[PDB]
Design an enzyme around this catalytic site. Structure first.
Site, mmCIF file in Angstrom:
data_model
loop_
_atom_site.group_PDB
_atom_site.id
_atom_site.type_symbol
_atom_site.label_atom_id
_atom_site.label_comp_id
_atom_site.label_asym_id
_atom_site.label_seq_id
_atom_site.Cartn_x
_atom_site.Cartn_y
_atom_site.Cartn_z
ATOM 1 C CD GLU A 104 11.562 -8.694 60.223
ATOM 2 O OE1 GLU A 104 11.704 -9.347 59.172
ATOM 3 O OE2 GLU A 104 11.583 -7.445 60.235
ATOM 4 C CG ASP A 105 15.242 -9.959 58.922
ATOM 5 O OD1 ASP A 105 14.393 -9.356 59.614
ATOM 6 O OD2 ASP A 105 15.996 -9.368 58.109
ATOM 7 C CG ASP B 28 18.583 -3.464 66.515
ATOM 8 O OD1 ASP B 28 19.174 -3.736 67.583
ATOM 9 O OD2 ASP B 28 18.853 -2.460 65.825
ATOM 10 C CG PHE C 256 25.523 -5.113 61.011
ATOM 11 C CD1 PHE C 256 24.528 -4.211 61.363
ATOM 12 C CD2 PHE C 256 25.498 -5.685 59.749
ATOM 13 C CE1 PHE C 256 23.537 -3.856 60.456
ATOM 14 C CE2 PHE C 256 24.509 -5.343 58.831
ATOM 15 C CZ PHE C 256 23.534 -4.419 59.183
ATOM 16 N NE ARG D 239 18.200 -8.207 51.089
ATOM 17 C CZ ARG D 239 17.745 -7.744 52.250
ATOM 18 N NH1 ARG D 239 17.538 -8.564 53.263
ATOM 19 N NH2 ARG D 239 17.521 -6.451 52.405
HETATM 20 O O1 LIG Z 1 23.012 -7.366 62.825
HETATM 21 C C1 LIG Z 1 22.182 -6.873 61.860
HETATM 22 N N1 LIG Z 1 22.258 -7.284 60.579
HETATM 23 C C2 LIG Z 1 21.437 -6.815 59.606
HETATM 24 N N2 LIG Z 1 20.495 -5.890 59.873
HETATM 25 C C3 LIG Z 1 20.378 -5.425 61.170
HETATM 26 C C4 LIG Z 1 21.196 -5.891 62.177
HETATM 27 N N3 LIG Z 1 20.835 -5.245 63.349
HETATM 28 C C5 LIG Z 1 19.818 -4.395 63.063
HETATM 29 N N4 LIG Z 1 19.533 -4.490 61.756
HETATM 30 C C6 LIG Z 1 18.486 -3.749 61.044
HETATM 31 C C7 LIG Z 1 17.123 -4.431 61.006
HETATM 32 N N5 LIG Z 1 15.997 -3.539 60.728
HETATM 33 C C8 LIG Z 1 14.987 -4.264 59.983
HETATM 34 C C9 LIG Z 1 15.457 -4.838 58.677
HETATM 35 O O2 LIG Z 1 15.485 -3.971 57.578
HETATM 36 C C10 LIG Z 1 14.716 -4.275 56.437
HETATM 37 P P1 LIG Z 1 15.138 -5.862 55.582
HETATM 38 O O3 LIG Z 1 15.198 -6.971 56.696
HETATM 39 O O4 LIG Z 1 14.111 -6.253 54.562
HETATM 40 O O5 LIG Z 1 16.518 -5.683 54.834
HETATM 41 C C11 LIG Z 1 15.483 -2.998 61.977
HETATM 42 C C12 LIG Z 1 14.585 -3.808 62.863
HETATM 43 P P2 LIG Z 1 14.182 -2.905 64.401
HETATM 44 O O6 LIG Z 1 15.421 -2.185 64.842
HETATM 45 O O7 LIG Z 1 13.701 -3.878 65.512
HETATM 46 O O8 LIG Z 1 13.070 -1.855 64.121
HETATM 47 MG MG LIG Z 2 13.918 -7.289 58.568
HETATM 48 MG MG LIG Z 3 18.423 -4.248 55.656
#
Ligand SMILES: O=c1[nH]cnc2c1ncn2CCN(CCOCP(=O)(O)O)CCP(=O)(O)O
Ligand SMILES: [Mg+2]
Ligand SMILES: [Mg+2]
Ligand SMILES: O=c1[nH]cnc2c1ncn2CCN(CCOCP(=O)(O)O)CCP(=O)(O)O
Ligand SMILES: O=c1[nH]cnc2c1ncn2CCN(CCOCP(=O)(O)O)CCP(=O)(O)O
Ligand SMILES: O=c1[nH]cnc2c1ncn2CCN(CCOCP(=O)(O)O)CCP(=O)(O)O
Ligand SMILES: [Mg+2]
Ligand SMILES: [Mg+2]
Ligand SMILES: [Mg+2]
Ligand SMILES: [Mg+2]
Ligand SMILES: [Mg+2]
Ligand SMILES: [Mg+2]
Lengths: 200, 198, 198, 201
Positions: D117-118, D121, D170, D183
């Protein structure tokens, strides 16, 4: 270009000259397209793509599963171009898997770059364009790592081609045989014994 | 092992399929050995090297100037190994040039790194000298070995590619100091062989 | 100017990176990760072509510590020459403090001195005074590290990182010929000073 | 296991003018937060730790789309290098999921599963996903996340491999997104106020 043309009499490379995971020892016959060559060709492919498309915003469309590795690299070479020039085509990424139905209004009015590992019969890619074109993109182009020379070919030609190969069964660089050989970085040819050991 | 054999009939690759420095467009005939192939072969070479020469301090000895790209790449691959393995071995580097401070070699494993071997006069001269300093071991890795009737009969301990008697440049190999700045090995065309002609 | 690494920059725990096992007890911290080094070198390569990418470059490599920064910077410049809208022919030579020889080949050319670290500056005074002997069209200096150290003239044209007056090793920088085979720049430990001490 | 590279709340990052940066993101970013190469050097090590834990049985690597794709590719690339530079080597197979769920996870069964996973949070996403994976009876599940956020909203979930432990800021780049933007960026970086107001959903 029809890509780097690999001929039917291409001997490829002995596996003993390269670094290959020990578990696929008896499973491969030859190294067919060295990882390195795939990188070098891909670098030129990325320039070619940038010449033709940027241009404008791009939505890079990755066809899982076999497409992921070419996609990754190609994008990286593109990103490398976007950060050493004025020519900076912004780019969002997207993913589809095709098992032939999909697993997309984002594409509407967009320049879409489909990124695939291999066209064989061209049937998959026809199913893809028609599905995509239903979402009315602005333009659509296809990049394929490999294009097989095959009688089975309906004759769809990709816009961008890495290599034109014979109809041998090749694996590696994310191209699998029954989910195996993706964890290999060269494109190689299965052995008879490999086909047999990993038969579904 | 003789290394990756390239036949006297291999056509190399069309230049348009690759990214090539624009200032070398008209000066090269074909891409002969693609950079990435050099890498893949080098990666294995490093593992082969590490089999024979690990287990004792290796002095890597770059042969300037053509040997510098191979040397750097080969050694990055070696270090990649040494930092991902239970035990590893110390390594020192040093440089030499042969025109036409070595007690640091005594007791060590010397690994001479060379670009191309041809008649092999060059390397036999180096080996003559190196051996006087009582290394524990001496092995030579050369990216290229030319099949040539002029070869005195020297063969390296490590070969990347065996190539025909054609004049090649790139990946640090020069023609009158040129083409060092080019990562593919390529055949120099006539319309450029005379352009950089001394 | 370069990447200003702070005096009180802690660095990174060794156990978070991959370090050759033979240097485990010899390093204190990772100071400049291999990859940060690469990223900033990529940027320098663009600067070099920005200032000198309009004529013949002679890249000068200051052995021994410079060989990596040189290989890598030249690799990044090389990537520019085949991918961008500006292509600069480039030849190389190597000096150690002789060296090569010949150096007349500099006259009327853009010259890029590539050096690992500028501390007192005496090394660079010497190369700048050397290269100016052969009347180049332009001498420019790229140095990976520049210490914020008291020592008394020239300001480097291209600087990767500007660091405290700490002894650092790796990325071809050494302590007694050791640590050249390390990809990261790290702070030597006090036990490391003792073990490889002259 | 280890919290990975702890990046502090008052970490300043690096000035953009020092790096190679896509011209189209020039003014949308404030600082480079984690240079791409630092991600690489950390990833090389994470790979070895993964193999030391999971290398005893067939590994299935499960990429969490979309922001996990870059990490995933690089991590596997390192894992592959370890595997082909050793006489001992287990085979490895890959799969994908995006989170409802998108994307036959039966290939997980009886295997050693590494989820990639990336960023974690709140941690809800990972727990949600493990809820699914666990009922495909894998031999063993392990989570590697490139980033973990120090937030009071942290539900408590913690992964097994962590690249970096970041401040509540962020961050974008290295496939991590802001409304699908950023991205196509090498480095992990912090959005400026202009870029943030620009792309807000
Ligand atoms: O600093 C950040 N940068 C970018 N995205 C952020 C950041 N913090 C939370 N997020 C949202 C990440 N979310 C997941 C990513 O969203 C889908 P994606 O990675 O495919 O675009 C929430 C994970 P969690 O809160 O542990 O259920
Ligand atoms: Mg993610
Ligand atoms: Mg996202
Ligand atoms: O040499 C080969 N190696 C591996 N797979 C091969 C090969 N040839 C055709 N295929 C099957 C490719 N097919 C792709 C199927 O998707 C499997 P993926 O998720 O591993 O990428 C269809 C190609 P086409 O006939 O033009 O619609
Ligand atoms: O095809 C070629 N391309 C480039 N250079 C070639 C080639 N063949 C021989 N050479 C010159 C190599 N000779 C030495 C030149 O190297 C000095 P350099 O690294 O400064 O260019 C001797 C080889 P040998 O006969 O085994 O003692
Ligand atoms: O932290 C350090 N690590 C390694 N070497 C250091 C360091 N600081 C100064 N030096 C001495 C480097 N000098 C060059 C090194 O010696 C020969 P080498 O590069 O072949 O190992 C030049 C510095 P200066 O002339 O005072 O501007
Ligand atoms: Mg496919
Ligand atoms: Mg399949
Ligand atoms: Mg030579
Ligand atoms: Mg020569
Ligand atoms: Mg110096
Ligand atoms: Mg010294």
């Amino acid at each position: 270009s029809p890509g780097v043309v690999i001929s039917d009499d291409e001997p490829g490379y002995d596996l003993d000259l390269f670094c290959i995971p020990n578990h696929y020892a008896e499973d491969l016959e030859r190294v067919f397209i060295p990882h390195g060559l795939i990188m070098d060709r891909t670098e030129r492919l990325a320039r070619d793509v940038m010449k033709e498309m940027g241009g404008h915003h791009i939505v890079a469309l990755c066809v899982l599963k076999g497409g992921y590795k070419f996609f990754a690299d190609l994008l990286d070479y593109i990103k490398a171009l976007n950060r050493n020039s004025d020519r900076s085509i912004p780019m969002t990424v997207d993913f589809i898997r095709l098992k032939i139905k999909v697993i997309l209004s984002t594409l509407t009015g967009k320049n879409v770059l489909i990124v695939e590992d291999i066209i064989d019969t061209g049937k998959t890619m026809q199913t893809l364009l028609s599905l995509v074109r239903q979402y009315n993109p602005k333009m659509v182009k296809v990049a394929s790592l490999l294009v097989k020379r095959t009688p089975r070919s309906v004759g769809y030609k990709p816009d961008f081609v890495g290599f034109e190969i014979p109809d041998k069964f090749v694996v590696g660089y994310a191209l699998d045989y029954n989910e195996y050989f993706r964890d290999l970085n060269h494109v190689c040819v299965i052995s008879e014994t490999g086909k047999a050991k990993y038969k579904a």
